[PDB]
Design an enzyme around this catalytic site. Structure first.
Site, PDB file in Angstrom:
ATOM      1  CG  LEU D  41       0.518  -9.175  10.451  1.00 61.94           C
ATOM      2  CD1 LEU D  41      -0.782  -9.411  11.116  1.00 61.94           C
ATOM      3  CD2 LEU D  41       0.923 -10.504   9.010  1.00 61.94           C
ATOM      4  CG  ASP D  42       1.860  -4.405   5.139  1.00 60.18           C
ATOM      5  OD1 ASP D  42       2.759  -4.079   4.180  1.00 60.18           O
ATOM      6  OD2 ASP D  42       1.606  -5.783   4.560  1.00 60.18           O
ATOM      7  CB  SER D  43      -2.229  -0.440   7.800  1.00 64.12           C
ATOM      8  OG  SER D  43      -1.489  -0.289   6.325  1.00 64.12           O
ATOM      9  CG  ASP D  45      -1.618  -8.021   5.884  1.00 65.24           C
ATOM     10  OD1 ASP D  45      -2.148  -8.171   4.662  1.00 65.24           O
ATOM     11  OD2 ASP D  45      -0.191  -7.464   6.055  1.00 65.24           O
TER      12      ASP D  45
END
Ligand SMILES: CCCCCCCCCCCCCCCCCC(=O)OC[C@H](COP(=O)([O-])OCC[N+](C)(C)C)OC(=O)CCCCCCCCCCCCCCCCC
Ligand SMILES: CCCCCCCCCCCCCCCCCC(=O)OC[C@H](COP(=O)([O-])OCC[N+](C)(C)C)OC(=O)CCCCCCCCCCCCCCCCC
Ligand SMILES: CCCCCCCCCCCCCCCCCC(=O)OC[C@H](COP(=O)(O)OCCN)OC(=O)CCCCCCCCCCCCCCCCC
Ligand SMILES: CCCCCCCCCCCCCCCCCC(=O)OC[C@H](COP(=O)(O)OCCN)OC(=O)CCCCCCCCCCCCCCCCC
Ligand SMILES: CCCCCCCCCCCCCCCCCC(=O)OC[C@H](COP(=O)(O)OCCN)OC(=O)CCCCCCCCCCCCCCCCC
Ligand SMILES: CCCCCCCCCCCCCCCCCC(=O)OC[C@H](COP(=O)(O)OCCN)OC(=O)CCCCCCCCCCCCCCCCC
Lengths: 177, 606, 459, 87, 128, 99, 155
Positions: D41-43, D45
């Site tokens: 997951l990204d930041s 997210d």
């Protein structure tokens, strides 16, 4: 800005804080759930469009114009949580948060109503006064010469001893006393 | 006569008994709020009897029981006045505070200081009943200051919260400017008419009565939160909900309107004061309704609503209809208090959430409070044959067919439409639609106290306007001949407001986004009045306090002129005198010079 | 008046022959007995004063001040016995002796029929207070405070002695009963102008007037608690009594020579209340509040109407009681936290609830909540000044607003909010402090039931 | 009013909210699964996850504590510490 | 574009609109590190005095004593009479006194002149 | 990123101590150890006795002094009959009917 | 405490400026005293004149209500910039625009109230008629004189 453990805010931290503020204010403007979901996805697409940018000056200018855009389009009064600062019930229970050192001034007649509680209080105080010198000796040899650089405290390295400066953050009053 | 005065004085003594009961208590009181509630119900019955006597015959009396003081010609006695206003207001206030204390028994159940809360509420009720039954201006001032101090103590109930302290101090400040007005009026009455009792004031009847009337208008502006001194009433929402529902809705804030009602023989012969009151009331009602149009806090919406209703009361005072104004006071108390109680129920069921953006779907989840909210909003807007119909439409009918300011009438009508708009805004955003509150649901309203209090105020808001308007004697000539369009003005304006706000909510439901305008920011941010005034005036006053008075004058200059300069002069003279070199030759030369000066220049040998 | 003088001087062998532990009990008991005895002065008549002898008399103005003094002495004995706990016994007896001597001079001052005897006692009151301030005060600048206080009083009062001796030589007597019937108009000249200045400046300094008030936030601050109580409660009222007695000889020159001091004292109370708004010290804030209230009394005496005189004497008594209670409360806070800073110890209502109630009552009486005698005096002065001129209502209303502001600022800062974290020596309130607070409060609340005994000689 | 909380209820509710997320396969996450590494997951997210948990529990987590909440166990421990549960 | 936020005395510029916030140069990083070091050292001193089990009193703050001494006992030693101080003292000290004197004198002269001609209505005035 | 290992260890130990302290705040079943310490009396003690006292005070101490309870004289219509004098107030004139 | 920790006079040389900056616990580059115009400030630092509301509310302050830290240099007007008093937080609208909008609204309302006072509304009716010489004796006129007869006719 004002941080206990860091001296500055990184670029990624600024971008994330802007993203959270913009999404909260967009939720304030768009009170219904489906409408907020649609416009949140549009805002997420706008944020993901410029995610892969390696130019530092261009990313900085994008952040600055995004902050200007947010300030032009903020809500006059956004939604604040009831316990959040600026909320309706923020710091409401501070009048009931009596500190624990007031129990030492109780009369013995009213101390007899809670025998086991005051026995547990006595052994807690015995533990604190036994561990204080050990924890200050641990803290003395871990601080570099010239003072500490940040405000972070070390944990207890060995077995048996408690972390340094633990009393007033363990015995703090409950949120609903 | 022997039953009238006995029952009135025993109602007052019955109200003051539980204060002495709690002050002389050692152990923990066994259900003290129940004792206070039972006392207030008994006092309501006991005060309900003399109003039946007054309705039957018209018996108004004055009881000057205890002589207090005699300052030369002036004579101060403990004097109470049983007239139309006292008998029509005391049981209404007692009924409303009975319902409020039952709602407080439900609401503040988990508070560890509930006994102090009920003692403060009873103290406020005692001071207000001192106010409304007062005969001379000194007793009226005692009630004035008592309700002000109780408002200060009750707004800042959670004293560990800073915003409560700011709100309480701000309310005190605005009420003290009202006190300036009251003091000026009382001083004029003493100096020019040699009395403080109202009977001599009405008997002498001054013609050049502009100055005391402006003093009373300023006092009522301060107390009833008219324009200029308004924002303390919406700022006073920091206290608990029963405190708001009693004081800042139905009882405390109508004291200025009541004070101007009591002096109606003075204002009825003065067109200047009437025009001033009409303009101030129209300004207040339209400005506060326009501010209420775009608020999100439910309690702030109801605070702006009751300020708009007080502006309407000032309007109908200004058109020389004071008995209609009093009828509107008695009407408005019921449904405003019950609207506040239902808002408090919604707040309590959603874990202290006061935002209407986090509500919705409560039409079927909480049916009784929904029913009461709908009935109260309909009675507030002026639905026919509810309690608000018997006072508000007569106010509009008299305002239309009178020698009136045109602009004041126009903003009165626009404010009526705005009241309709924000009423249906509350109903739409708080009951209709889909839920917006957090996931875990602890919605409950099945407590006998809350249900019973809301039920009593609901029956009141259904039938009390009819009963009161059919029981009061005719003190004026009702205007009942008017054209068709002037008769249908109030209903058409309310219907237009309902249609406009229904369309506004439907357009809100759409999937479009628009940037806010300057009108929206003007209405939402309270017209920029608190943000400018509360930042500008304290800045100037406190900077003048420190940079001019505390430092420049008495720490620098008043210290410079008298003591420091004198001390330095004596120090310099001492250093010149004692700096001799200890030589006999110089001393004897000085002796020779002294002898020569005395012999020749001063002529001491003549 | 010998039936009150003789027990007061008999208090001296009582405190000098008591045991090492029974000095406070004996002195408090017998002073309370004499305070009960002081009620016999209330035999006042509607036409004539109560004239005892050639040297002593007591009308309805001096009687409330006498009862206040004789009641205030045991309060100071109860207040001053905690910070003198570790003191030497001889120094403790010397402190009690100075209090007794000050009470003797004060009860001989209010009853003096001759004006020069009033002057002699009124300046004999300087020595015990100066000794108390400069010896038992806690700070460095108590010596400077004593110098300022002494020299302001003496520089103001030496022309008063010269003018009183001139009046004695010109009229033939300084007896106040004679001068009521032998008085003459004082015409407009420069000689009579400086007569008015000489007769008035001593009491203008002692009250104090705005601009001559620089000694007050020093003497009221560096003094001990008993010294602050006797300075705020009685010693400021010697100036008021002096102007009430001496204005009889200064007519009709007062009607235009009173203009500059009326403008000084009308504008001065606004300045002192604004100073109270921005004070970091609690004791200094109470002292400046005293300056404002005494400015009100100055205006009331200077406009010389019956309502103004009644308001002036009622306001004098009420402010004496209220200022004494406020100084006692501030002293209790000082004993708890060992600092006079107002921002240091906060949120004490969560720790000291009944003391917070006492604070609330004292603050409420400070801002003249009706029907307290504070409001009665302030209201009567406001009515009389409105009769004087109409813009005085603007000035009085502004003063009332700022007075409520700083009183509630005091209360909200000290008692409300979040408590200080690092202060953990907040002991529960003793019975002695609560008894002192109640003995300040209950007479003040009871006097609202019968306010006619504090309304001066022309009630 | 105000029903109490436990670690079991907190963990069940936080796993419910994280299970209703479309970007996380529900058969793979656990109490100590990481966001950037174990879940991909990204930041952003993580920020949206934190906002969802704030909306679920009705109280605000500050950003200076939100950046460090990286697995569901730390979210549970943060909520347990902020609301003072198991007393 | 968007209307630029102009700061005022009573409405400061936000920290997200300040152009000096986004500075990344090493001098500003060194300054921020030094400020954090000072703050952390002072916090360590306070918490060492704060968590002592054997302490029962007041952790004295030299900054507060410094503030009170500066507010009270430094003003006259650091005062020099010049044009600005004398001008402000004459404006705020004798200005309002003269203004109110002339206002009250004019009002009382007008009232006393109207009274002596019998033009002022004083019919029921017997309280003064 | 997340916490450092030292931050994690300190948080774990502080949380354990906090939970032990919060557990120790519970009450024993024997606590608190308390020391060993006409249906309608409200209508009698709170109404009837003050009504007796107030009626006594008003009858024998307030109505004795003059002008203490001033009561508005009763409203008199045509066709009435005075109790004290016994006279009959004459009826008003005939109406010139319009409806 | 000592006399070398208390405030002093205005620093002239950079050495005493550095000593004062160390005294108040702040960096020498960030330490600015008040200008030496004789107002009486001394060497007390000129902090940026912001209210305590602008501080971070989520930081763990030593004094949480005041948002103040132990040992930190305290502002000259801190008792004025508390959360109970004057606020300096940024506003959603520019200060000049709020001032002009509020003033224009108040002035326009006053002007239209004056215009409506000049041109009022009424109804197409004549004056109200009262019997017995416009109720002469009921209005307080003495009966020994005789008023001018006010006669109202039918229409
Ligand atoms: C708790 C149990 C107590 C005992 C219970 C058993 C006995 C109860 C009593 C039974 C009846 C006794 C006889 C009747 C009562 C006494 C009658 C009598 O002559 O009384 C003498 C007089 C009657 O007045 P008066 O006219 O005769 O004399 C007044 C006194 N002078 C002239 C000196 C001014 O006094 C009283 O009645 C005093 C009691 C009054 C009750 C109300 C007090 C209110 C206090 C308010 C203070 C502030 C007011 C501010 C506003 C003022 C106005 C602007
Ligand atoms: C606290 C600081 C301020 C203190 C202010 C004190 C008051 C200020 C004015 C005092 C004037 C001096 C006393 C005058 C007594 C007058 C009695 C009398 O009979 O007067 C009529 C007499 C008239 O003289 P006569 O009565 O002998 O003559 C008979 C009358 N005729 C004239 C008609 C023939 O006045 C005088 O003799 C002169 C009076 C003026 C004196 C001027 C010098 C003093 C100036 C002021 C000094 C103030 C203190 C300075 C120091 C302060 C501290 C460092
Ligand atoms: C019919 C006639 C109508 C006439 C209308 C026009 C005349 C009156 C104009 C208005 C005057 C009063 C309003 C201005 C001052 C208001 C001060 C106040 O209470 O401010 C509130 C503020 C806290 O509230 P706020 O900032 O909103 O909080 C939000 C969350 N922090 O609280 C603070 O900031 C605390 C400040 C404490 C110190 C206040 C100092 C200023 C006091 C000014 C008094 C002026 C009295 C004038 C009397 C004249 C008499 C002739
Ligand atoms: C009182 C009389 C009520 C009946 C006559 C007036 C009806 C009315 O005003 O209707 C307008 C409107 C409903 O009409 P509309 O919005 O077109 O339809 C909604 C979908 N059924 O809106 C409403 O009917 C709601 C508002 C009615 C307010 C009545 C009391 C004031
Ligand atoms: C309104 C009234 C205004 C005048 C009031 C009297 C003067 C002011 C108050 C008394 C003096 C105040 C004071 O302490 O001044 C200090 C100054 C120097 O004192 P110093 O001896 O250096 O200090 C000792 C160690 N610190 O002391 C000196 O320089 C000595 C000054 C002595 C003045 C005595 C009073 C003389 C009055 C008549 C003059 C003719
Ligand atoms: C500093 C601290 C704060 C303040 C503390 C108190 C300070 C002030 C105390 C004294 C005030 C001044 C004295 C009272 C003046 C009252 C008005 C008056 O009478 O002024 C005198 C005179 C008025 O003129 P006129 O009426 O013609 O005089 C002839 C009289 N036979 O006026 C004039 O002719 C103008 C002035 C001429 C010079 C007068 C000098 C003597 C008076 C001051 C000493």
């Amino acid at each position: 800005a004002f941080l206990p453990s860091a001296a500055y805010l990184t670029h990624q931290q600024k971008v994330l804080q802007l993203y959270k503020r913009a999404l909260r204010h967009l939720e304030s403007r768009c009170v219904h759930r489906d409408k907020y979901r649609y416009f949140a996805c549009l805002l997420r697409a706008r944020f993901d469009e410029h995610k892969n940018e390696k130019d530092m000056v261009k990313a900085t200018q994008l952040l600055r114009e995004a902050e200007k855009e947010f300030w032009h389009g903020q809500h006059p009064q956004p939604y604040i949580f009831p316990e959040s600062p600026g909320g309706t019930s923020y710091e409401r229970y501070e009048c009931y948060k009596v500190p624990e050192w007031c129990l030492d001034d109780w009369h013995p007649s009213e101390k007899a109503m809670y025998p086991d509680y005051f026995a547990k209080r006595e052994q807690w105080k015995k533990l604190r006064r036994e561990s204080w010198e050990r924890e200050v000796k641990q803290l003395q040899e871990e601080t570099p010469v010239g003072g500490p650089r940040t405000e972070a405290l070390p944990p207890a390295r060995k077995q048996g001893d408690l972390p340094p400066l633990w009393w007033h953050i363990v015995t703090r009053p409950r949120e609903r006393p | 006569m022997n039953l009238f005065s006995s029952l009135t004085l025993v109602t007052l003594i019955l109200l003051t008994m539980p204060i002495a009961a709690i002050n002389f208590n050692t152990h923990k009181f066994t259900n003290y709020p129940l004792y206070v509630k039972t006392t207030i119900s008994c006092a309501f019955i006991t005060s309900m009897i003399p109003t039946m006597m007054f309705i039957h015959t018209g018996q108004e009396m004055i009881i000057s029981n205890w002589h207090w003081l005699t300052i030369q010609t002036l004579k101060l006695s403990l004097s109470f006045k049983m007239d139309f206003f006292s008998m029509m207001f005391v049981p209404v206030a007692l009924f409303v505070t009975w319902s409020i204390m039952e709602f407080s028994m439900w609401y503040m159940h988990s508070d560890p200081n509930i006994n102090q809360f009920f003692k403060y509420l009873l103290l406020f009720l005692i001071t207000m009943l001192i106010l409304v039954t007062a005969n001379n201006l000194f007793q009226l001032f005692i009630g004035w200051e008592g309700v002000g101090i109780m408002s200060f103590l009750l707004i800042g109930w959670w004293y560990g919260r800073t915003d409560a302290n700011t709100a309480a101090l701000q309310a005190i400040l605005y009420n003290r400017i009202g006190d300036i007005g009251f003091i000026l009026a009382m001083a004029w009455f003493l100096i020019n008419l040699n009395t403080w009792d109202l009977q001599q004031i009405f008997m002498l009847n001054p013609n050049d009565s502009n100055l005391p009337l402006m003093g009373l208008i300023l006092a009522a502006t301060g107390k009833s939160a008219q324009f200029g001194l308004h924002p303390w009433l919406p700022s006073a929402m920091e206290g608990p909900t029963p405190v708001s529902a009693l004081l800042h809705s139905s009882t405390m804030v109508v004291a200025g309107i009541f004070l101007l009602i009591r002096f109606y023989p003075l204002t009825e012969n003065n067109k200047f004061g009437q025009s001033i009151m009409l303009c101030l009331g129209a300004m207040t009602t339209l400005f506060t309704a326009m501010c209420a149009l775009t608020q999100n806090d439910i309690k702030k919406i109801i605070a702006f609503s009751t300020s708009s209703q007080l502006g309407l009361m000032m309007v109908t005072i200004g058109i020389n209809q004071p008995h209609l104004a009093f009828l509107h006071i008695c009407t408005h108390a019921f449904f405003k208090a019950m609207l506040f109680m239902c808002s408090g129920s919604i707040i309590h069921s959603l874990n202290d959430e006061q935002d209407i953006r986090k509500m919705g779907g409560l039409f079927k989840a909480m049916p009784f409070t929904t029913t009461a909210l709908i009935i109260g909003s309909l009675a507030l807007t002026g639905m026919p044959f509810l309690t608000g119909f018997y006072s508000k439409d007569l106010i509009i009918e008299s305002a239309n067919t009178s020698y009136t300011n045109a602009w004041a009438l126009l903003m009165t009508l626009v404010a009526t439409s705005f009241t309709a708009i924000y009423s249906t805004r509350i109903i739409f955003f708080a009951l209709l639609g889909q839920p917006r509150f957090p996931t875990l649901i602890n919605i409950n309203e099945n407590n006998p106290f809350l249900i019973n209090s809301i039920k009593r105020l609901l029956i009141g808001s259904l039938f009390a306007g009819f009963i009161i308007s059919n029981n009061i004697p005719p003190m004026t000539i009702p205007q009942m001949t008017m054209p068709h369009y002037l008769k249908m003005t109030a209903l058409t304006v309310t219907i237009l407001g309902f249609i406009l706000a229904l369309e506004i909510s439907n357009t809100t439901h759409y999937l479009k986004f628009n940037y806010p305008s300057n009108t929206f920011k003007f209405s939402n941010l309270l017209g920029y009045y608190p943000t400018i005034m509360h930042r500008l005036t304290p800045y100037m006053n406190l900077t003048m306090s420190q940079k001019s008075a505390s430092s420049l004058l008495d720490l620098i200059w008043l210290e410079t002129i008298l003591p420091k300069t004198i001390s330095l002069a004596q120090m310099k003279m001492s250093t010149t005198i004692t700096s001799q070199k200890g030589l006999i030759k110089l001393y004897f030369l000085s002796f020779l010079i002294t002898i020569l000066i005395s012999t020749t220049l001063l002529n001491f040998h003549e | 008046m010998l039936k009150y003088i003789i027990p007061t001087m008999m208090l001296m062998p009582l405190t000098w022959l008591s045991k090492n532990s029974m000095i406070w009990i004996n002195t408090t008991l017998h002073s309370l007995l004499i305070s009960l005895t002081s009620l016999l002065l209330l035999n006042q008549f509607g036409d004539n004063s109560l004239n005892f002898s050639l040297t002593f008399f007591s009308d309805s103005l001096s009687t409330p001040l006498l009862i206040l003094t004789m009641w205030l002495l045991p309060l100071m004995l109860m207040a001053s016995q905690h910070h003198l706990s570790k003191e030497n016994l001889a120094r403790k007896k010397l402190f009690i002796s100075m209090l007794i001597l000050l009470q003797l001079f004060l009860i001989m001052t209010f009853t003096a029929t001759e004006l020069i005897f009033f002057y002699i006692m009124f300046e004999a009151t300087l020595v015990p207070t100066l000794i108390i301030i400069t010896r038992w005060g806690n700070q460095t600048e108590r010596l400077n405070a004593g110098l300022y206080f002494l020299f302001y009083t003496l520089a103001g009062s030496l022309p008063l002695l010269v003018a009183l001796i001139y009046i004695q030589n010109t009229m033939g007597s300084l007896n106040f009963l004679i001068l009521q019937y032998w008085v003459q108009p004082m015409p407009n000249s420069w000689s009579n102008t400086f007569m008015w200045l000489a007769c008035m400046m001593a009491f203008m300094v002692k009250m104090p007037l705005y601009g001559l008030h620089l000694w007050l936030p020093k003497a009221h601050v560096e003094a001990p608690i008993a010294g602050s109580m006797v300075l705020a409660a009685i010693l400021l009222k010697l100036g008021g009594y002096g102007m009430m007695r001496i204005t009889l000889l200064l007519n009709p020159i007062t009607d235009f020579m009173a203009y500059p001091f009326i403008m000084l004292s009308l504008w001065g109370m606004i300045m002192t209340s604004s100073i109270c708004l921005r004070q970091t010290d609690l004791k200094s804030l109470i002292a400046y509040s005293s300056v404002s209230h005494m400015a009100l009394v100055i205006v009331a005496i200077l406009i010389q109407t019956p309502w103004s005189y009644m308001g002036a004497t009622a306001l004098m008594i009420a402010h004496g009681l209220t200022s004494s209670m406020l100084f006692c409360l501030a002293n209790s806070n000082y004993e708890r936290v060992h600092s006079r800073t107002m921002i240091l110890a906060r949120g004490l209502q969560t720790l000291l609830p009944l003391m917070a109630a006492w604070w609330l009552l004292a603050s409420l009486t400070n801002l003249a909540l009706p029907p307290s005698i504070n409001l009665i005096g302030e209201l009567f002065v406001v009515m009389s000044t409105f009769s004087w001129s109409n813009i005085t209502i603007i000035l009085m209303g502004l003063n009332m607003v700022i007075t409520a502001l700083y009183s509630l600022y005091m209360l909200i800062t000290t008692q409300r909010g979040k408590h200080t974290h690092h202060i953990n020596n907040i002991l529960p309130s003793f019975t002695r402090e609560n008894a002192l607070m109640s003995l300040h409060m209950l007479p003040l609340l009871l006097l609202s039931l019968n306010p006619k005994i504090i309304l001066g000689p022309l009630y | 009013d105000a029903p109490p909380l436990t670690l079991e209820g907190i963990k069940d509710r936080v796993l419910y909210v994280l299970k209703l997320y479309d970007k996380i396969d529900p058969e793979k996450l656990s109490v100590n699964s990481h966001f950037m590494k174990d879940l991909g997951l990204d930041s952003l997210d993580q920020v949206e996850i934190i906002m969802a948990m704030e909306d679920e529990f009705g109280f605000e987590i500050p950003d200076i504590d939100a950046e460090k909440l990286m697995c569901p166990q730390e979210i549970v421990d943060y909520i347990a510490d902020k609301k003072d549960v198991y007393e | 574009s968007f209307p630029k936020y102009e700061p005022s005395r009573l409405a400061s510029l936000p920290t997200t609109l300040d152009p000096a916030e986004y500075d990344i140069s090493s001098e500003t990083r060194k300054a921020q590190a030094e400020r954090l070091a000072i703050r952390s050292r002072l916090k360590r001193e306070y918490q060492l005095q704060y968590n002592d089990p054997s302490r029962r009193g007041v952790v004295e703050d030299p900054a507060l004593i410094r503030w009170t001494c500066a507010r009270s006992a430094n003003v006259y030693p650091n005062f020099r009479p010049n044009t600005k101080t004398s001008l402000l003292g004459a404006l705020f000290g004798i200005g309002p006194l003269i203004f109110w004197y002339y206002v009250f004198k004019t009002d009382r002269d007008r009232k006393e002149k109207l009274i002596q001609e019998g033009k002022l209505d004083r019919t029921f005035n017997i309280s003064y | 990123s997340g916490y450092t290992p030292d931050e994690k260890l300190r948080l774990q130990q502080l949380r354990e101590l906090r939970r032990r302290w919060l557990k120790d705040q519970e009450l024993s079943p024997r606590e608190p150890v308390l020391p060993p310490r006409r249906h309608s009396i409200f209508a009698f003690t709170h109404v009837l006795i003050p009504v007796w006292i107030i009626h006594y005070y008003l009858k024998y101490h307030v109505t004795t002094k003059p002008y203490t309870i001033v009561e508005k004289k009763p409203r008199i219509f045509p066709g009435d009959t005075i109790l004290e004098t016994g006279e009959v107030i004459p009826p008003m004139k005939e109406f010139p009917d319009q409806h | 405490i000592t006399k070398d920790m208390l405030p002093g006079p205005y620093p002239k040389t950079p050495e005493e400026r550095a000593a004062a900056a160390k005294k108040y616990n702040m960096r020498v580059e960030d330490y600015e005293p008040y200008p030496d115009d004789g107002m009486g400030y001394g060497d007390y630092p000129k902090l940026p004149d912001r209210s305590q509301q602008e501080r971070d509310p989520w930081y763990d302050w030593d004094h949480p209500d005041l948002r103040l830290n132990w040992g930190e240099p305290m502002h000259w007007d801190l008792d004025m910039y508390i959360r109970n008093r004057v606020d300096t937080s940024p506003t959603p609208v520019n200060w000049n625009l709020m001032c002009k909008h509020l003033f224009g609204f108040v002035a326009f309302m006053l002007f239209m109230f004056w215009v409506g006072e000049t041109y009022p509304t009424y109804q197409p009716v004549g004056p109200k008629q009262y019997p017995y010489n416009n109720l002469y004796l009921e209005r307080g006129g003495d009966p020994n004189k005789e008023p001018e007869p006010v006669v109202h006719y039918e229409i």
